[PDB]
Amino acid sequence: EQKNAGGVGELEKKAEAGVQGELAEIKKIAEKKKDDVVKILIETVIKPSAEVHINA
Amino acid sequence: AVEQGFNVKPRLNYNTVSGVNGPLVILEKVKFPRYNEIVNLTLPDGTVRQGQVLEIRGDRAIVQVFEGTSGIDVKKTTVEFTGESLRIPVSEDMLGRIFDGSGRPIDNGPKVFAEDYLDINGSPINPYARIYPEEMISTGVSAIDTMNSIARGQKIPIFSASGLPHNEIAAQICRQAGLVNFSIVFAAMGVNLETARFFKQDFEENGSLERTSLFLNLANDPTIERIITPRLALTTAEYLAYQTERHVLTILTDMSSYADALREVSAAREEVPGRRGYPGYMYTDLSTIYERAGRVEGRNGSITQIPILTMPNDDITHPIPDLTGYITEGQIFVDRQLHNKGIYPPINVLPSLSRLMKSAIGEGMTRKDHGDVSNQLYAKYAIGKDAAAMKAVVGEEALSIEDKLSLEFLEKFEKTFITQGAYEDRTVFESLDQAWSLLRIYPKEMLNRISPKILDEFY
Amino acid sequence: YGAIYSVSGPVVIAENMIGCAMYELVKVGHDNLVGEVIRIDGDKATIQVYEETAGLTVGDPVLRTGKPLSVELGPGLMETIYDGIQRPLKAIKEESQSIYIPRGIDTPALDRTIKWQFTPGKFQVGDHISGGDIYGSVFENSLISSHKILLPPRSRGTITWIAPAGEYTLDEKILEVEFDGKKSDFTLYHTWPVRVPRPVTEKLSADYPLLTGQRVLDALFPCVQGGTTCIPVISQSLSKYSNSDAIIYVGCGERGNEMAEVLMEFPELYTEMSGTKEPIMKRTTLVANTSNMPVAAREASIYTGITLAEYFRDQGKNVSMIADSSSRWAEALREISGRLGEMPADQGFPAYLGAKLASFYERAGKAVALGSPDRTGSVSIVAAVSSDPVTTATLGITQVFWGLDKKLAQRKHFPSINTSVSYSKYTNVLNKFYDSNYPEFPVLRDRMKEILSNAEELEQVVQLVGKSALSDSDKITLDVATLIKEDFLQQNGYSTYDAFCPIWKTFDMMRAFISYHDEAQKAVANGANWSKLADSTGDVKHAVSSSKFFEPSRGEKEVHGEFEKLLSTMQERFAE
Amino acid sequence: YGAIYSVSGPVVIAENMIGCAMYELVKVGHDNLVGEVIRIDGDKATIQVYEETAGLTVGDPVLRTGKPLSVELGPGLMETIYDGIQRPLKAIKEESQSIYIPRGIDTPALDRTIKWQFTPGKFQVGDHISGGDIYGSVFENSLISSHKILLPPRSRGTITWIAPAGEYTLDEKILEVEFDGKKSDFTLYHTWPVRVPRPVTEKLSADYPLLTGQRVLDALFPCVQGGTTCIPGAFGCGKTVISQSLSKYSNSDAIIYVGCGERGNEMAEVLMEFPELYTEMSGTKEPIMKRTTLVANTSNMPVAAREASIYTGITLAEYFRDQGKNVSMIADSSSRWAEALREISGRLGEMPADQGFPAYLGAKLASFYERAGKAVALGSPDRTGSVSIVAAVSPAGGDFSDPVTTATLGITQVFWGLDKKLAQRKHFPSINTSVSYSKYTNVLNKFYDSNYPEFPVLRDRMKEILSNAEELEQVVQLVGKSALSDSDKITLDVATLIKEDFLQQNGYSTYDAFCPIWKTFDMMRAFISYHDEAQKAVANGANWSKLADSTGDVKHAVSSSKFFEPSRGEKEVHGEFEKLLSTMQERFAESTD
Numbered sequence A: 001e002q003k004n005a006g007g008v009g010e011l012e013k014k015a016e017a018g019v020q021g022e023l024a025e026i027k028k029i030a031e032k033k034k035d036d037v038v039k040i041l042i043e044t045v046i047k048p049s050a051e052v053h054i055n056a
Numbered sequence B: 001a002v003e004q005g006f007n008v009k010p011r012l013n014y015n016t017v018s019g020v021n022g023p024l025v026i027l028e029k030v031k032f033p034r035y036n037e038i039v040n041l042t043l044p045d046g047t048v049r050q051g052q053v054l055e056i057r058g059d060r061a062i063v064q065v066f067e068g069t070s071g072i073d074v075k076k077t078t079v080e081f082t083g084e085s086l087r088i089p090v091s092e093d094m095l096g097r098i099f100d101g102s103g104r105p106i107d108n109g110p111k112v113f114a115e116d117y118l119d120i121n122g123s124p125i126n127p128y129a130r131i132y133p134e135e136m137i138s139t140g141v142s143a144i145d146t147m148n149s150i151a152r153g154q155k156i157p158i159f160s161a162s163g164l165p166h167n168e169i170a171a172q173i174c175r176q177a178g179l180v181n182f183s184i185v186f187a188a189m190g191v192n193l194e195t196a197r198f199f200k201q202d203f204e205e206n207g208s209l210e211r212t213s214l215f216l217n218l219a220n221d222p223t224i225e226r227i228i229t230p231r232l233a234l235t236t237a238e239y240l241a242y243q244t245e246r247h248v249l250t251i252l253t254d255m256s257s258y259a260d261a262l263r264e265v266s267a268a269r270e271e272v273p274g275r276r277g278y279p280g281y282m283y284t285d286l287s288t289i290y291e292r293a294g295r296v297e298g299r300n301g302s303i304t305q306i307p308i309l310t311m312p313n314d315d316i317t318h319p320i321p322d323l324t325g326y327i328t329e330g331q332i333f334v335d336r337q338l339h340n341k342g343i344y345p346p347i348n349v350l351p352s353l354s355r356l357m358k359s360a361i362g363e364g365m366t367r368k369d370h371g372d373v374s375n376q377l378y379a380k381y382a383i384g385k386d387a388a389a390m391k392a393v394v395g396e397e398a399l400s401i402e403d404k405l406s407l408e409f410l411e412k413f414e415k416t417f418i419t420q421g422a423y424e425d426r427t428v429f430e431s432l433d434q435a436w437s438l439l440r441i442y443p444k445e446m447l448n449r450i451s452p453k454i455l456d457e458f459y
Numbered sequence C: 001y002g003a004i005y006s007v008s009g010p011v012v013i014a015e016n017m018i019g020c021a022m023y024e025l026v027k028v029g030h031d032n033l034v035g036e037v038i039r040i041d042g043d044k045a046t047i048q049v050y051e052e053t054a055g056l057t058v059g060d061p062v063l064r065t066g067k068p069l070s071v072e073l074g075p076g077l078m079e080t081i082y083d084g085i086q087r088p089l090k091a092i093k094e095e096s097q098s099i100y101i102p103r104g105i106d107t108p109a110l111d112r113t114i115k116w117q118f119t120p121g122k123f124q125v126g127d128h129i130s131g132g133d134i135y136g137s138v139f140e141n142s143l144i145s146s147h148k149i150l151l152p153p154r155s156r157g158t159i160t161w162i163a164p165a166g167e168y169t170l171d172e173k174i175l176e177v178e179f180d181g182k183k184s185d186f187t188l189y190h191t192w193p194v195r196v197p198r199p200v201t202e203k204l205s206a207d208y209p210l211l212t213g214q215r216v217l218d219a220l221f222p223c224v225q226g227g228t229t230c231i232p233v234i235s236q237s238l239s240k241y242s243n244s245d246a247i248i249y250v251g252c253g254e255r256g257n258e259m260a261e262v263l264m265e266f267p268e269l270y271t272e273m274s275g276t277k278e279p280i281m282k283r284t285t286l287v288a289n290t291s292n293m294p295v296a297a298r299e300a301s302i303y304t305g306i307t308l309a310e311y312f313r314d315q316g317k318n319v320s321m322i323a324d325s326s327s328r329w330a331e332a333l334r335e336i337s338g339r340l341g342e343m344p345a346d347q348g349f350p351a352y353l354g355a356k357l358a359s360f361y362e363r364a365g366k367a368v369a370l371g372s373p374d375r376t377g378s379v380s381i382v383a384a385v386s387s388d389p390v391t392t393a394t395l396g397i398t399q400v401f402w403g404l405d406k407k408l409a410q411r412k413h414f415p416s417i418n419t420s421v422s423y424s425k426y427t428n429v430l431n432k433f434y435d436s437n438y439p440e441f442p443v444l445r446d447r448m449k450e451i452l453s454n455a456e457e458l459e460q461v462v463q464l465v466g467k468s469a470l471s472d473s474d475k476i477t478l479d480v481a482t483l484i485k486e487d488f489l490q491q492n493g494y495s496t497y498d499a500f501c502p503i504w505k506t507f508d509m510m511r512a513f514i515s516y517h518d519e520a521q522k523a524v525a526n527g528a529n530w531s532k533l534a535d536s537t538g539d540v541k542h543a544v545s546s547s548k549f550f551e552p553s554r555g556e557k558e559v560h561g562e563f564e565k566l567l568s569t570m571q572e573r574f575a576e
Numbered sequence D: 001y002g003a004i005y006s007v008s009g010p011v012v013i014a015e016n017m018i019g020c021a022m023y024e025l026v027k028v029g030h031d032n033l034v035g036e037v038i039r040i041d042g043d044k045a046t047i048q049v050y051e052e053t054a055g056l057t058v059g060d061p062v063l064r065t066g067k068p069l070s071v072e073l074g075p076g077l078m079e080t081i082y083d084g085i086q087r088p089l090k091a092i093k094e095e096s097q098s099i100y101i102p103r104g105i106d107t108p109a110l111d112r113t114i115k116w117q118f119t120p121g122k123f124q125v126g127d128h129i130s131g132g133d134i135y136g137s138v139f140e141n142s143l144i145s146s147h148k149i150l151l152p153p154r155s156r157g158t159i160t161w162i163a164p165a166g167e168y169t170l171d172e173k174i175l176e177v178e179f180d181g182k183k184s185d186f187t188l189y190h191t192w193p194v195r196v197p198r199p200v201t202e203k204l205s206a207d208y209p210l211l212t213g214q215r216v217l218d219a220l221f222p223c224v225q226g227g228t229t230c231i232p233g234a235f236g237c238g239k240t241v242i243s244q245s246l247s248k249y250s251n252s253d254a255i256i257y258v259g260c261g262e263r264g265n266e267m268a269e270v271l272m273e274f275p276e277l278y279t280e281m282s283g284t285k286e287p288i289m290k291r292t293t294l295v296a297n298t299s300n301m302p303v304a305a306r307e308a309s310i311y312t313g314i315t316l317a318e319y320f321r322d323q324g325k326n327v328s329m330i331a332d333s334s335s336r337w338a339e340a341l342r343e344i345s346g347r348l349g350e351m352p353a354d355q356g357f358p359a360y361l362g363a364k365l366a367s368f369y370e371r372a373g374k375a376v377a378l379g380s381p382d383r384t385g386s387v388s389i390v391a392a393v394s395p396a397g398g399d400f401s402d403p404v405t406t407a408t409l410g411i412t413q414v415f416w417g418l419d420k421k422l423a424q425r426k427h428f429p430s431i432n433t434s435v436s437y438s439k440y441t442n443v444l445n446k447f448y449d450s451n452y453p454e455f456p457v458l459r460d461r462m463k464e465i466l467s468n469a470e471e472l473e474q475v476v477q478l479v480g481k482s483a484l485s486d487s488d489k490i491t492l493d494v495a496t497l498i499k500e501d502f503l504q505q506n507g508y509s510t511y512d513a514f515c516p517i518w519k520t521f522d523m524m525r526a527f528i529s530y531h532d533e534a535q536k537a538v539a540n541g542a543n544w545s546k547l548a549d550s551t552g553d554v555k556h557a558v559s560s561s562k563f564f565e566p567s568r569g570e571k572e573v574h575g576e577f578e579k580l581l582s583t584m585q586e587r588f589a590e591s592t593d
């Protein structure tokens, strides 16, 4: 049990190291598509539609 | 490719709450109320509770509140009509997470990054598009894989009374539910924290937490979101199994508590009650829940549904187990008497039935002797119960030679075949070999239900 | 255009709905959900919807179609899987290209793109035509060679124009009828309400047995073409080799995988009734309706199936109709009553359960189809049930009953037909056929019934008293009855030899078993000890127990000769 | 303020009440009767009144208090008896100078005049203090000393002024938290809604046994500290006596006895008996009553107040768990809560569930029993409290098929089913060993391995003996004892001895009021050894008929082992049991020689 307990920190460090690439990829994707998504969201929020209820 | 809509639909906020009683909130002057709509009641304390429109009139909307109507004020509660039925945001990353009853996360993780907004009620599968499931799963339990075999795509519940190890049996099936890589979705329905923690611990220990999504609705959780929990869990299962071509093993524990939630909601609507006060439409509700199993013609996926059920007073005649037997395909009957005698699993194979064993039994699927062995075991166990009753009533000496052999078989069958430790994973072939070692107690003449071409080859 | 006023599950009250009628289909909502009016009270008209009612908003228009729940009768019913209200599931899956049923689907019940080869009937232009008259026959497929298309019942006149022979669809007129001064046009198909039974010239007595195939049923509890059975294996046996010219399988509240099994087994299973092996689908129609589908559709599936069978016997074809789980139809009725608020009677069921079951079962029976040429059909109804109010109301109208024995089912003895509680009230009508074909069948059937009843009476005393000193005659009777239960009554449906035991083979096996019993009684009366006769005639006992294995494919002449040898061997062995 | 509009028993539909919330507390009537809202229909809000509604008149003002039913928590809770609503019965009696509960008494929940020796905790001025943190301990009594004053669970922020050590009344401010610029003053007591469970950091598996002190209970059907328990049984079975013998001698640090629909003389008996008993815990002979608080809502007191009494009891138990005490709340006659719910639903006209009960009875009971369970307290320092719920479900007519009994068995992990037939024979506590079970036997292996390693083995062995002899006696009652073998006769005699001298525990007796775990284990070992050695002797060839007469002395010594008073000490009684086992072995050796 002591041997297994000692490896928890090493296992945690190894898991943290592998994730760090995914965080970098997420940051890169966000930085690349931030302008496009922001433009789409703003253009959707402004310029509203105006339609009465279909049953009215 | 994929199609989606960046659309913003403003939502009407109604402060016009008329009255509130039980789980129901009645609004007063809704504009074009929509049936089965989801509304967000903003309490005076500021907390927001979701709802669901159950019935509408010209201007009224009898909203049921998932998180309970405690603290709702008729003069300060504002109802926000979203404009669509309850849609869960699903994703392929939803596997490995834990969600509350209402679909919100419990673990420290963030809100699920949506991949599609699926309606929880689902859509009816075309029966022409359903594939009959003829691929048995080797659950590892002897009394299931040998006499009540489960096919991958079958909705088979576990009828267990209060206090029996149905949780242990279902955890065992989940642990060793391979074929003769199952993704799992779990819908805890008012199970106590002890049972929920046991299920979570088993799923973590067996390595299943990497591929399972739990929908925990504890006994402390509100008693009306038990009506959203099965639908959320099953629409997640449908998403994974069909639209990701995955295999899913859904575990809807405490369908008795689900039916109790339906009774609580129905009795507050003053609807015409069925037997035991349950709603008349409870067959249709339980059908909408259970009938979301089975494989499909196009998508390589299967929802093997195992809804654990708590039959009160250990009775089949009770409406919940009765209608679950009507809808589902057989049942796994857990016996209080066997559990008291100390057998595990305490499965009583006499009320137990599996409607797809007739097709997934054998003759090239698992083994040539599977069906006949199962039939022989069931027949001799019925004979053993009859002989035990006869011996108890009119003495053991009056029992015939066949009856005495049946009693010996019953003893050696309960104590050596049904009796198996948890985390024991005997294959279907090992189960059949143990069954034969039981059936060799009888002479070859008294094994009539065995076909002779198999008797002469396996005796 | 009526407007929705209230929605609460299936029931949908609609306002501004004057001029409506009870049990009238109305398209509900913007998606045109099909719904039937169940209660009109002033402007309001309560509507049960046959689809998912979620998403209906107050103010959605509902429009009255002016007709009751109408099945579309015509060519193209064969080999089509239909939903509860006759929506073609195969066509829905093909059109939508998705595994789901689209909400408010409007696919036609009959195929409007298939050209049908139509041959005009004996009616010629100018000849007066009556309701139900056959004005032509159209080829459908190998089994239904002549799908004789009728004129709609309750329509008549002088045919002012009849189409010539050729290929036609279901959207092109094939006959014009002048009627009472108002011209009308008729097509290869014609609608008919499910609620209103199709008329007859005259119902007849059902005198021909429906060969269910199972030994227990076809021997002790016969069903006749035009009977009602209330069955609790036999579905396919009556489907494949019952000599029924057509069969309309109906499923109510079927478990999804059971319905899938039926849909995957009926197309695969083939019959050799014709000159070659031909599929059953060419003969059958499946009204498949799982439990998931709306309760209104579940309630309507029985009526759809029975009116399809009524059409196929108005054509003059002996048609069966296997209604799976009529208990689920009764449950649908109970749920509908609960939705409406009507006060239940008995065990929560509607008070009119007896009336509904009678109005459904009474549609059966051999009948002379109305209108020339003269022709007779028979809807043999085989409903399935699961002390219940539904079964105690069924037993008053059904003429046969095959109640399942729980003890015999626990012993894995199939079919688990309870011999004491079952009956068949055609055992007197069917003497006209037994005395003509197999003269000894009634007497031997009564002999076997008496033997089984005596064994049942003796078994109670056996169980209560250990059964050490039974008389020799009583021991012989009980052993003979145990042999009968093990060999004659028991029938492995999946086995090749006992898949379909013909009536002649059943009669011969009855002869063999009754002859064994008579020989045993004679030997006992001779004074010889049955304890010794057991060993002496073990060979004959094994012979009669293995007579079950005589394959019917050998032919009636061959098999009857084999049994005659066995009975001859029986008399010779009596010298022991 | 609204007005009464209709009264029908314990429901008061009050008109002109736009603005009342669900489960809000109202003061119905001129006497300010305490009532809670349960249904709202426009202006009229249907109120259930926790007081005798007789004499109410239409138009009597009803005041909306603006807060749900709240129990005051803090020092002074211990060693007091309360009504259903949080009212001290002693203070009510001394205020009314009468022996009756007057309608509408509003005595403060906790004695304000009594001054407590507050001693500040580790928290200093400026340190961030979250909900449930301990900022001081008051000296309540000699037994519940250091009644650690928690911060309210919903309160948070930074300390601005904490009171120095000294004596303070409850109304005196003790601490002031500044949170986002809005300072809030905190005192020794804080109100809490009874319906809302008190938050905890994280619940834990309950791995330590609630030693009831009764041999049958803690030797066959153990209950762990933090496990729900149920005691079904007809009248006279002994649910109340089991509950009292649990609250008298358990290992629980504090006890919240709840007499929801009990008898008045039972609560009077508790009030006079607890001060006369002393708990050996805390290193002194401090009285039991210094650790028990009582919520007495007797059977004839208002029907609606039974629910309030149950919720108040469980909230007090939750508070004392958050303090870090192994509480054991005891809900006497929990079925009376179900009957109160049925009566209120009948007044409301709501559609019934099975057997008259409302459709939500199962949900209410489940949410109540889920409050139990060991859990780490909410704030620093780390604390591990526990609430054990031992509720006596009282079936209607003695049949366990009652809806309340089924809805309780579905949630409780322990089932101490009592038998009326064993109760009649004075076979007490009359635990029906056939149907009773405890789902904590597997959990308690981790404790029985550390202490008393052979305890589980003996427990399964005695359950085997009892089951085998029950089946054998069932057969014999119809087939006579002629066909029994010598081993079967030994099983019958040994199980009769077990039932009549080990399982039976005569409470209200000097010797067997409290048979602790060590004496129970030693007696269990003696009984099991007697059975095993008798069976070995009969297998060696000695006839049982002669062996019974030869070893009647050993059998009577075994049956008389229950008379060893536990007060003699663990070492003394263990020595006596070792001597008895040696004498037993010698007697069998001499007999079989």
Ligand SMILES: Nc1ncnc2c1ncn2[C@@H]1O[C@H](COP(=O)(O)OP(=O)(O)O)[C@@H](O)[C@H]1O
Residues within 6 Å of the ligand: D233, D234, D235, D236, D237, D238, D239, D240, D241, D242, D428, D429, D505, D506, D507, D508
């Ligand atoms: N363990 C026990 N030891 C001695 N007497 C007991 C015991 N249990 C119950 N009794 C007797 O039972 C009576 C009280 O039973 P009680 O617990 O009040 O049952 P109920 O709660 O059903 O009324 C008392 O008179 C007492 O003498």
